[PDB]
Amino acid sequence: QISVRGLAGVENVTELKKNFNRHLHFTLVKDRNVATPRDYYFALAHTVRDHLVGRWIRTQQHYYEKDPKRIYYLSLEFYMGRTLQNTMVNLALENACDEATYQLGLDMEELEEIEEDAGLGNGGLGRLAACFLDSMATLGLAAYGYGIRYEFGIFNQKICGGWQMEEADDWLRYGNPWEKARPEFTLPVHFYGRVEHTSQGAKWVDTQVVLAMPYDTPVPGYRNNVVNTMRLWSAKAPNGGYIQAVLDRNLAENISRVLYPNDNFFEGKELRLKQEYFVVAATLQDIIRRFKSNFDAFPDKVAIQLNDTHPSLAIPELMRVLVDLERLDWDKAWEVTVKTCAYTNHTVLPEALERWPVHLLETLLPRHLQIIYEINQRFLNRVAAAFPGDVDRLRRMSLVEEGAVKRINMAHLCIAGSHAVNGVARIHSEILKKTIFKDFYELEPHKFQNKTNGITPRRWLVLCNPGLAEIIAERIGEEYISDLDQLRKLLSYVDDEAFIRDVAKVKQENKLKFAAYLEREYKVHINPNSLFDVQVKRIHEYKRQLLNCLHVITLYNRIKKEPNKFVVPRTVMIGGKAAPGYHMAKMIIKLITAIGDVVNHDPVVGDRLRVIFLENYRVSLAEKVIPAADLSEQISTAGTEASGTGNMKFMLNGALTIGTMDGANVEMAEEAGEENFFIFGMRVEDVDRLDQRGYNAQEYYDRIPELRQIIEQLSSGFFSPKQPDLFKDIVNMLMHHDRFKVFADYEEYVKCQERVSALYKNPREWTRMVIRNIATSGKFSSDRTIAQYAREIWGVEPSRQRLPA
Amino acid sequence: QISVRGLAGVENVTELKKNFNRHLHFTLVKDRNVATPRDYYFALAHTVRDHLVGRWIRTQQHYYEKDPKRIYYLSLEFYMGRTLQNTMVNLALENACDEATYQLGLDMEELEEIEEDAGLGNGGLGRLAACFLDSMATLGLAAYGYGIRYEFGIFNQKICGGWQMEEADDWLRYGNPWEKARPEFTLPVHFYGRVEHTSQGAKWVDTQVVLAMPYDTPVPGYRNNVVNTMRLWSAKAPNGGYIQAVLDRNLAENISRVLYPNDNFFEGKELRLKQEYFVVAATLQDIIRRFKSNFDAFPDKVAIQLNDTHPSLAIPELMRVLVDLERLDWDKAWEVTVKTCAYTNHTVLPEALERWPVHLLETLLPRHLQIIYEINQRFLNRVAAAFPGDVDRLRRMSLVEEGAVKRINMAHLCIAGSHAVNGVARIHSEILKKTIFKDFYELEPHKFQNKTNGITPRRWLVLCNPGLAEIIAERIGEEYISDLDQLRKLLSYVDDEAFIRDVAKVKQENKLKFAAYLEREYKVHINPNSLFDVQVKRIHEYKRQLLNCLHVITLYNRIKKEPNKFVVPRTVMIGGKAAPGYHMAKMIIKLITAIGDVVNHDPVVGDRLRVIFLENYRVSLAEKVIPAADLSEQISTAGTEASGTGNMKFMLNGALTIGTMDGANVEMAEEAGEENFFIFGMRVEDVDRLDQRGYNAQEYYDRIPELRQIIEQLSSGFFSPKQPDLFKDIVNMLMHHDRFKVFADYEEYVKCQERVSALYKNPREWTRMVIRNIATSGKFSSDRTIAQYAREIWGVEPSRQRLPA
Numbered sequence A, B: 001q002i003s004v005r006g007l008a009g010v011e012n013v014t015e016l017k018k019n020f021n022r023h024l025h026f027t028l029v030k031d032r033n034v035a036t037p038r039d040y041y042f043a044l045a046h047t048v049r050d051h052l053v054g055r056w057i058r059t060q061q062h063y064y065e066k067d068p069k070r071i072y073y074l075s076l077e078f079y080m081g082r083t084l085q086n087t088m089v090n091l092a093l094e095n096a097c098d099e100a101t102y103q104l105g106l107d108m109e110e111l112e113e114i115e116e117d118a119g120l121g122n123g124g125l126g127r128l129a130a131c132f133l134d135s136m137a138t139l140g141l142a143a144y145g146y147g148i149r150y151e152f153g154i155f156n157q158k159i160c161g162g163w164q165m166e167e168a169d170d171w172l173r174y175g176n177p178w179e180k181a182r183p184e185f186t187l188p189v190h191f192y193g194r195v196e197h198t199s200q201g202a203k204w205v206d207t208q209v210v211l212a213m214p215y216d217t218p219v220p221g222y223r224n225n226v227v228n229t230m231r232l233w234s235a236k237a238p239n240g241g242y243i244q245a246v247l248d249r250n251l252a253e254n255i256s257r258v259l260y261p262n263d264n265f266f267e268g269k270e271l272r273l274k275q276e277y278f279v280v281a282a283t284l285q286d287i288i289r290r291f292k293s294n295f296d297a298f299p300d301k302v303a304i305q306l307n308d309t310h311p312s313l314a315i316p317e318l319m320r321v322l323v324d325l326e327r328l329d330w331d332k333a334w335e336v337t338v339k340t341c342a343y344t345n346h347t348v349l350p351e352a353l354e355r356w357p358v359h360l361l362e363t364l365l366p367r368h369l370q371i372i373y374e375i376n377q378r379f380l381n382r383v384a385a386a387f388p389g390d391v392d393r394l395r396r397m398s399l400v401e402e403g404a405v406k407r408i409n410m411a412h413l414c415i416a417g418s419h420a421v422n423g424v425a426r427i428h429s430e431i432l433k434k435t436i437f438k439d440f441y442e443l444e445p446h447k448f449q450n451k452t453n454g455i456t457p458r459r460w461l462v463l464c465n466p467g468l469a470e471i472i473a474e475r476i477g478e479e480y481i482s483d484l485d486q487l488r489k490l491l492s493y494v495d496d497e498a499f500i501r502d503v504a505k506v507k508q509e510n511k512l513k514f515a516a517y518l519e520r521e522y523k524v525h526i527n528p529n530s531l532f533d534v535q536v537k538r539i540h541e542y543k544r545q546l547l548n549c550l551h552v553i554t555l556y557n558r559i560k561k562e563p564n565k566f567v568v569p570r571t572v573m574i575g576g577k578a579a580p581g582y583h584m585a586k587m588i589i590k591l592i593t594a595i596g597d598v599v600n601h602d603p604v605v606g607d608r609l610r611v612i613f614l615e616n617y618r619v620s621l622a623e624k625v626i627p628a629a630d631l632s633e634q635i636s637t638a639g640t641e642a643s644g645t646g647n648m649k650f651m652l653n654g655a656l657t658i659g660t661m662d663g664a665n666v667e668m669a670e671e672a673g674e675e676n677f678f679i680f681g682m683r684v685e686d687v688d689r690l691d692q693r694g695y696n697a698q699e700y701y702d703r704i705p706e707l708r709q710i711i712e713q714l715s716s717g718f719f720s721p722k723q724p725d726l727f728k729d730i731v732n733m734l735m736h737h738d739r740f741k742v743f744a745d746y747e748e749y750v751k752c753q754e755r756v757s758a759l760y761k762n763p764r765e766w767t768r769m770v771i772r773n774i775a776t777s778g779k780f781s782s783d784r785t786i787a788q789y790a791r792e793i794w795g796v797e798p799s800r801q802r803l804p805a
C-alpha cells in the first residue's frame, strides 16, 4: 500500500474499529443489520473527528498562554470541500482507517463519496480562503477563519436538455459531523436604526437586532499537531399576530440562508450587504473581547485580512467600536485601524467592484456612512496636501462616487483604511500600481504589494493524487509535502526511465479511475486512450470557454474534410457553473452540449473526438478530474485573470498547460521554462493596442475561412436544427460586442493546439515535459504564499515545529 | 438518601463519571476550566442517554420478531416536559448519577434546571398524550407516538405591567440530546393539486410536495427494559429568481414551525389544516410500509388512536391509500378503516369543534373531500335504513354542515370512521351518549365507551415528589409505582402517628422548596406558614379563575371590615397561559395581578393574605408547585370540564380538593369519599334548570351585598385607580353575558372555602384527610387507563414483564 498515507498500527486499527462500532451503536443508534453506507460514513467521520479534539483544545490553549499575534481571515467564502480524507491525511490516520474499515468489510473510498461538500464559495477566491486556512495551520500561525455558515452553498448544477438547472445545495441535510455549535457564544448584530449625537459622542439606537451564532470547524495542520479554527456565523432571531410574528423570524434568519452565486459580478442586493455587515460585526466583537482577555497594542496583537472588499465594512466597524464604544479619539482610532487592516484585491473587471448606493448605507448602516464620509474627508485632505491643486485626482481617489445615484467605492475605502494592499500574482499586482490604483500607489507606494496565489499540496496532491505523491516520495522522501520547493529535486529524474514510466503509469491510472467515475455515476463513456483536454472553472466570457468551443468545432470540421488523416484522439471536457442570471454564460453551457450532440454522434468521427460537459463542478469533482487531465486549459484574455489557481492544480498533477500570458500563468511559465508550456495569443500589450484602434471582429471573420465556416454553422443552425437561431446572441456578441476578443486569439490558439497534439504523439517527450512541470510547481504552494503574508503584512514568523502529542 | 431512587453501585458511579468526562471532552469539546453548568448538564444528558440505546434497539427488534399488534397514537400534541430526570427514574440511575455528579463537585438538581421543556402541547390533551406514551411503555405495548416536531412549542409567558407577553419558545436553541434524526426515513406529503378520474380509478396529481423528516425520541418504561418510540415529523422543502426560490423554501418549512396556542378553541387556519394532514399522511405511510414488512389482517396488526379530531383526516387518508394506491374495493377498504380507527373526544364546548370549510378542503385536499362526501352518502344511507323517514336525524348526523359556508364536521367523520368513540371521564362519556352524540349512540351503541383519564405516577409522584414516594415506600414497598391501586394499603395508616407526622413533614419541605424557587428565580417572597391555595391550568372562562378572584377579593374585604378577627393565612397562587387572541383571558390575568397590587401592599393585611400569578405555567413548573400545594382549585362550571388531569396531580401529591361535581372530580370524590373533598356549587342538573329559565346575574347581585361590593370595586376602579374603567368588559360580561354562571356558585364557594379554612386550623385532621385522598388516588394512574384502552379498544393484553438486560 502507499507509505505516504502512513502506518496501520496494530493497536491503532483495533482501537479505530472499536470506536467505529461504538459510534454506530451510541451515536447513530444502528445495528449492522439496518446500517447503510451513509451510517458507515458517519461512524467513520465521528471516529476520525475524535482524534482532532485533544489537539484542538491544546492548540487554542497554547495560543492563550503564548499570546502571539492573532490573524483574522475575513471572507464571505470558504470553499472547503469534504473534510474526512483531509483530516485523516493531516493526522497520519489514512492507511490505518483504510485497514480498520477493510477489516470491518467496508471500502473507505466508497464511504468518502457520501460526504457532502462544504461548497461555501463560488470559485477561486473562496478556495484560496480554504487553502489559506490549511497553510496557516501547517505554518503554526494563530489564525482564525471568520465567515458565514450558509444554509445553502453554491447551487447544485444539473444539466437538462443541455441546459443548466439550479437546485438548492442542502448540504446540512444529514448533519455536519465536523462543526461544533457554540450557541453560548452568540452575539447581537444591529441593523437600521439611527444616530443620536450627544454627550459621550454618537449613539446608534433604535436598531433591529440579528443574533450571530458561531459554529467552529477544526482546521488541522499537516502532521504538526496544530488544529486551528474556522468560525462561521449563523443568523438567529432575537426574542400580524402571534403566529405571523413567530414565522417572520425567518426574515432575519434569511441573512445566513444562501451563498450569492455571483462569481466576479456585482449585484447590489441589500441582503448581500446585510451578509457582509453580519460577518464583520460579529467577528470584530470576538476580536475585541479576545483582545481584552488601551488600544495602542491592538495592531501588535491583531491582524485583520480582508478577502476582497466583501468584509470592507470591518474598517468603519472597527472605527465605530473604538470611537463610539471605547471612546478613543478619532486619530488614535484611525492609526489603530489602518495598522490592523490589510486588503486583498482579486480582479480588475469593473463590474465586480462593490459600489454601494449611499441611500442603502444610510438606511441600513447610518453610523457607518457618517464614519465613511469622515474617513473620506480626512483622506482627501491628505491627497490635497500631497498634490496641491490636483482636483481631478481628488474626484478619482474619492471614496464617494457621484452620479444619478451616489455610491461608496469599497475598494477605495479598503486602500484608505489598510496598511497593505495586495494583488494575487505579479502581473496583477503591478497593474494595480501602474493603472487602476495608480493614484493611491502615488500617495502611498509602501502600501502596495504582491502575494502570488497558491494551492495546498495536501488537498491538491497527497489527498487527490496519492499515486503521484507516492512515486515522488519514493525518490525524495516526504519533506516536500510541507516544503514544496523540494520538488525541484525531480528535475534530476528527467532521464530516469523508472520515473518516466511511473509518471505516465500514474496518469493512466487516474484516467481509468475518472472514466470509471463517469461510467458509474453518469453512464457516460470516455475513450481511455485519448488526450484528456480539460477546461474547468466558473463559466465566464473572460475565461473564454467559447474560444475552446471554436477549437472543438475546428477539429470536427477538419476531421470531416479529411476523414482519412490521423489525428490524436481527444476527450474534451468542459465544466463549471454559470451564475443563475448570467444569460450568456448559460447560452455557452448549452452550446457546449449542443456541439457534443453533433460531434459525439457522427460515425465518421467515432471515438477520435468527444465533447462532454462535466456537471456540477465543485471541489470534490476537481480532485477527481484534475489528476486525470493531460491538457490544462487556461485561456483567459490577457489582462483579465488576476492569478487563477486551477492552473496551479493542473501543473502540480501532471498536466501540461495551454494558456495565455495572463495571471499566474506567466510565473508558472517562468518557473518551468516557456519551452515547457504551450503559450499563445496576445499579451497584455497587444490587447491594449487593439483597444486603442478598436476591436473589429469582422476583420478576423473576413480573413479566416475556417472561422467564417464555424460562425455560419452557428448562425444557420447546424448545432440546433430544431431551433435554427438558438445561438444568435452568441454570434452577435462575438461579431459585434466581444469585450474579450475571442476571434483575435483564434488562429494562434488552433496552431498551438496543433503543437500540443504533435507532442502527445511522442509519449516519452510528453512525460519528460510533464516532469519539468511538476518539478517546478513548488512556488505555487500556499505555504509559500502564507509565509509571505506572515512576514510582509501580518508581521508574524511562521513555523513547522510539532506541538506535543 | 432515598431508596426509591435506587442504588449507587460503586462500579456504576465510576463508569458514569468516566463517561461524563468523556462526553465533556469529545461531545462538548470542553476542559473543566471553560465549562459552564450548561456544558455539565449536556455531558450528563449524553451519559444518561447512552443507557437507553441498547434497550431501544433491543425493544424495537423484539417487536419485529414477536410481531404483536402495533398501536399508533396520533396527536398534534405531546406535552413532554424535561426528560433527564424521567430517564434516570425509569432506568434506576438517579441515585447513581446523583453520587457521580456529587463526586465531580456538581449538584445534579442544579443541572436539571438547565433542561428546556419539550412544551409541544397546550394543556390537558397534550399532557395526557405524554402520560399515555409513558404508561404504554411501562405496560409493554408496541406503541408508537406520532406527532409534529414543532420548532416552537407553547409560547414562553412573561408578565409585564401585570399583563401577559408572548415570546417564542426556542426550545431547540442549544440542541435536543434526546431525539434522533432519521433523515433517511424522510417521506413526501402532498398538498393542493387535483383529481383525475380514469382507468385504475382516481389519481391525485399536480400536487405540491412537502417532505416529512422523522425525529425519534426514546420512551422508557418503568424499570422493565422497554424503550418505545415517539416519532415527530419535521417539514422540509423538496428539491422571483434563484435567491427568492431558495428563501421561499421557508413557506413549506413553516408547516412544522409553531404549535397553535389555542386550547379548546377552533380557529380554522389553513396552516393548522396543513399541520394536521402533514402528520396524518406521513404517519400512515409509515404504518403501511411497516405493515407490509392483502389488508384483511390490517386491523389485527394496526390500531390508530385519534387524540381528538385533530388527526381525523387519517380516516379519509387511509381510505385514499387503500382504494387509490392499493386498489381495494371501497367496502373492503371501509371495513378495514373502521376496525383500525378509534376516536377520543376531549370537550363538549361547541366552539372547540373542528368544522372545516368545504372550499378549503376542496382546495388543499381535493381527493379527501370526494372521499368524505362518499363516506357521508353511505353513512347517511345507513341512518336512513335504520330510521326510515327521520329526515332531521339525517341533517343532524350529516358529516356535511349547511350554512352561508358549508363545512365538514370532523367529530362526525371520526364517529362514522371509527369502531370506538370514548369520552375522558364517566360523566363526560355518558353525556356523549345522552345528548351531544345521542343520534350516533342510537345508530351504533356498541361504539360508545368511557376511558377515564389518568396521570403517570412516575412523573407525577416519584419524579416530582420523591419525599412522598419515599415515605409511602417505607410502609408498603415499591410495587405501587407501577401498580397504583396498592396506595389503598395506606388507609390503614390513618391513625399512624409516624405516617401522619411524615406526610405533614414532606408537604412542608415541598413548600419550603417552592418558596425558595420563587425567591431564587423571581425574588418573590411567600409566607411559608400559609395555606398554599393553587389554581393552575390554562386561563379560560369555563375554568373560572374569575370565581377564584371573587373569593380572594371577598377575603380581603372581610379582613378590612374586621381587622382583629383571626383568619388562616393564605398564599393564593394562580398560573396558566391565555391564548394570544383571547382578550378576556388576558384581562383576567391582569385582574389577578391587579388584585395582588392592592392586596399585597395593604399593611392591615400584612402576610395574612397574598395573591400571586405564577408566570409561565408549564410541565416543569407543575412538578414544582403541585407537591407544594395545600388546596387544589378545580372549580369549572358543572358540565364544562370533560375530565381534567391537574385535579389528579394534586390528589396524588397531598393537596385537598375544592371543586365542583364536574369531570373526573366526581370519580375522585367517589374514590375518596365525598366527606374527604370540598365539593360545592351547582351540579349539571342545576345548570340545565338555570338555562331553561335563563341565567340572570342581576338577581345574584341584587341579593348578595358582598358580591355587589366587589363588582363596584371593579367598576369604580378600586383595582386600577390609574385606569378606572380597565375592568369594564369583565364586569359587563359577568353582569350580562356570563356563559359559565360565576355569580350562581359564588355563595356556595365562599362558604365551602370557610370550611376549608376551618379544617386547616386542625393540622392533624387536615393531614388525616390528605391521607384518605392519597390512599385513594390509585384509580387515576394512566396505567389503569391505558390497560382499559388495550383490552377494550385496541384488543391487546398489557404486561409488566422485564425485557432482559
Ligand SMILES: O=C(N[C@@H]1Cc2ccccc2NC1=O)c1cc2cc(Cl)sc2[nH]1
Pocket (backbone or CB within 6 Å): A049, A050, A052, A053, A056, A177, A178, A179, A180, A181, A217, A218, B026, B027, B028, B029, B042, B174, B175, B176, B177
Ligand atoms: O456537534 C458536536 N457536539 C454536539 C453537542 C450536543 C449538544 C446538545 C445536544 C446534542 C449534542 N450532540 C452533539 O453531537 C461536536 C463535537 C465535535 C468535536 C469536533 Cl472536533 S467538531 C464537533 N462537533
Ligand SMILES: O=C(N[C@@H]1Cc2ccccc2NC1=O)c1cc2cc(Cl)sc2[nH]1
Pocket (backbone or CB within 6 Å): A026, A027, A028, A029, A042, A174, A175, A176, A177, B049, B050, B052, B053, B056, B177, B178, B179, B180, B181, B217, B218
Ligand atoms: O443525535 C444523535 N446522533 C447524531 C448523529 C450525527 C449525524 C451527523 C452529524 C452529527 C451527528 N451527531 C449526533 O449526535 C443521537 C444519538 C442518540 C441516542 C439516543 Cl437514545 S437519542 C439520540 N440522538
Ligand SMILES: Cc1ncc(COP(=O)(O)O)c(C)c1O
Pocket (backbone or CB within 6 Å): A122, A123, A124, A127, A536, A537, A538, A617, A618, A619, A622, A643, A644, A645, A646, A647, A649
Ligand atoms: C471548484 C473550484 N472552482 C474554481 C477554482 C479556481 O479555478 P480557476 O483558477 O481555473 O478559476 C478551483 C480551484 C476549484 O477547486
Ligand SMILES: Cc1ncc(COP(=O)(O)O)c(C)c1O
Pocket (backbone or CB within 6 Å): B122, B123, B124, B127, B536, B537, B538, B617, B618, B619, B622, B643, B644, B645, B646, B647, B649
Ligand atoms: C402544564 C400543564 N397544563 C395543563 C394540565 C392539565 O391541567 P387541568 O386538568 O387543570 O386543565 C397539566 C396537568 C399540566 O401539566
